[PDB]
Amino acid sequence: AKLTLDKVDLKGKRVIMRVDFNVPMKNNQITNNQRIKAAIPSIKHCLDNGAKSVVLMSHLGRPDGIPMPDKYSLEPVADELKSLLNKDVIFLKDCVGPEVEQACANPDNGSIILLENLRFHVEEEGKGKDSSGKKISADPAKVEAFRASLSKLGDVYVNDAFGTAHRAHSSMVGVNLPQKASGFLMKKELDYFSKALEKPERPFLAILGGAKVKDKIQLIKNMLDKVNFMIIGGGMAYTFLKELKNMQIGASLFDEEGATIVKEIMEKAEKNGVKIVFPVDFVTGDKFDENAKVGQATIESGIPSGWMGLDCGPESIKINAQIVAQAKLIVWNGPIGVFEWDAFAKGTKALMDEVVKATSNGCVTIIGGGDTATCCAKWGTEDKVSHVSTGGGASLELLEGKILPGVEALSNM
Numbered sequence: 563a564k565l566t567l568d569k570v571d572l573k574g575k576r577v578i579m580r581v582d583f584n585v586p587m588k589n590n591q592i593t594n595n596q597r598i599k600a601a602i603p604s605i606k607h608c609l610d611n612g613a614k615s616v617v618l619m620s621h622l623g624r625p626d627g628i629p630m631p632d633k634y635s636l637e638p639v640a641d642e643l644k645s646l647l648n649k650d651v652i653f654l655k656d657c658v659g660p661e662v663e664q665a666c667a668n669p670d671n672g673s674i675i676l677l678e679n680l681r682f683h684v685e686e687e688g689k690g691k692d693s694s695g696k697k698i699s700a701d702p703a704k705v706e707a708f709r710a711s712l713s714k715l716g717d718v719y720v721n722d723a724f725g726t727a728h729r730a731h732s733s734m735v736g737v738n739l740p741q742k743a744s745g746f747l748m749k750k751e752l753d754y755f756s757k758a759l760e761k762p763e764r765p766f767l768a769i770l771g772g773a774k775v776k777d778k779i780q781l782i783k784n785m786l787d788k789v790n791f792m793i794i795g796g797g798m799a800y801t802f803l804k805e806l807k808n809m810q811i812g813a814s815l816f817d818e819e820g821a822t823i824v825k826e827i828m829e830k831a832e833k834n835g836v837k838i839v840f841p842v843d844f845v846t847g848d849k850f851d852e853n854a855k856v857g858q859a860t861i862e863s864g865i866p867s868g869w870m871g872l873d874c875g876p877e878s879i880k881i882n883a884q885i886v887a888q889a890k891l892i893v894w895n896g897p898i899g900v901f902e903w904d905a906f907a908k909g910t911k912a913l914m915d916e917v918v919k920a921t922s923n924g925c926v927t928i929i930g931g932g933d934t935a936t937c938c939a940k941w942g943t944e945d946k947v948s949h950v951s952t953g954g955g956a957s958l959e960l961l962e963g964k965i966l967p968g969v970e971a972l973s974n975m
């Protein structure tokens with residue numbers, strides 16, 4: 563329901579665009595330009611649609627409100643963008659100030675400008691850390707002076723940075739322009755999560771994985787008000803199993819605090835006519851380590867002392883397959899085993915295999931931006947599923963029922 567890039571007339575207008583350029587980079591090298599490739603459609607569309615200019619702002623790393631051009635500069639990204647675009651980019655040493663305003667006042671037609679790391683200013687995030695790592699706070703008055711500067715730099719504002727739309731930062735909620743719209747990536751993020759929330763197709767399956775239960779209560783609860791089925795994997799499972807199946811979980815992880823909301827969750831599951839499924843057998847390790855001895859266990863046998871459950875097993879994979887294959891909409895957030903290690907990634911991979919199969923068969927599949935979005939990368943299925951969120955933190959909040967400021971800041975119609 564929010565304004566989008568292709569619905570705005572960018573004829574002869576300057577465009578201030580907030581994009582995701584937080585790329586892994588060691589020594590100003592950039593070890594994965596993926597996120598930079600991703601923003602090109604939006605920028606291209608602006609040039610191709612008559613934009614006088616396009617001003618790009620972003621952040622990279624953890625400078626926490628201190629300019630740090632030596633390790634978190636966007637400069638290496640600015641000329642990496644030139645390569646990818648086969649067009650020169652003008653890098654500005656800062657993101658605000660007199661120089662930055664003149665440079666973007668009335669640029670030559672079609673020029674592309676990239677401002678320095680926004681987080682070099684404590685006003686962007688609204689918080690920070692000084693020379694000794696201690697937390698400092700931005701002055702609400704300087705924050706608004708910073709935002710007044712950023713707004714001048716453009717005539718139309720475009721947010722194509724979903725990954726930080728769950729945080730009301732300056733670049734996200736502070737640009738005051740008549741039209742604030744979603745970029746092509748952002749638009750896609752919204753288009754799909756809108757599906758899994760406004761009026762989902764059924765059967766709607768929610769696969770929730772992860773380590774602790776305490777920080778998934780909201781996500782679990784909000785999903786129970788919408789889905790038909792729900793699978794819970796990952797370390798969480800052991801908390802529910804010990805509490806619902808009197809299972810000896812050995813030395814597996816256990817969320818003591820979350821264990822007290824279990825019965826509250828199962829209630830929710832019942833009032834909403836949903837039946838959660840958990841593993842039934844497990845792949846174990848004699849220690850939380852990649853090359854640990856691998857063993858097997860079931861709910862009945864439980865994990866031996868010392869050992870711990872690290873991935874679901876053969877019967878769990880089968881049950882999972884059956885349920886995945888009967889869904890029209892699947893939302894997957896969180897692997898169901900320690901995917902970082904192959905000895906215990908089988909369950910997660912099998913699930914991926916099945917989910918990809920569901921996409922081919924008409925099922926819309928949505929993946930969380932965190933640990934799950936990287937799984938598609940490690941196994942090239944980023945183009946075999948309906949959607950892979952480009953932002954873990956934001957997708958989690960969206961799926962939790964929380965308000966995403968960056969989004970509500972966008973214009974309507």
Ligand SMILES: Nc1ncnc2c1ncn2[C@@H]1O[C@H](COP(=O)(O)OP(=O)(O)OP(=O)(O)O)[C@@H](O)[C@H]1O
Pocket residue numbers: 771772773774795796797815871872873895896897898899900901902930931932933934954958
């Ligand atoms: N059976 C398990 N035992 C111990 N740790 C596990 C197990 N399964 C998964 N994990 C761990 O869960 C960790 C992530 O936990 P956390 O809940 O913080 O993120 P998450 O639930 O995976 O969310 P997301 O996938 O969106 O980033 C992974 O790094 C993985 O190592």
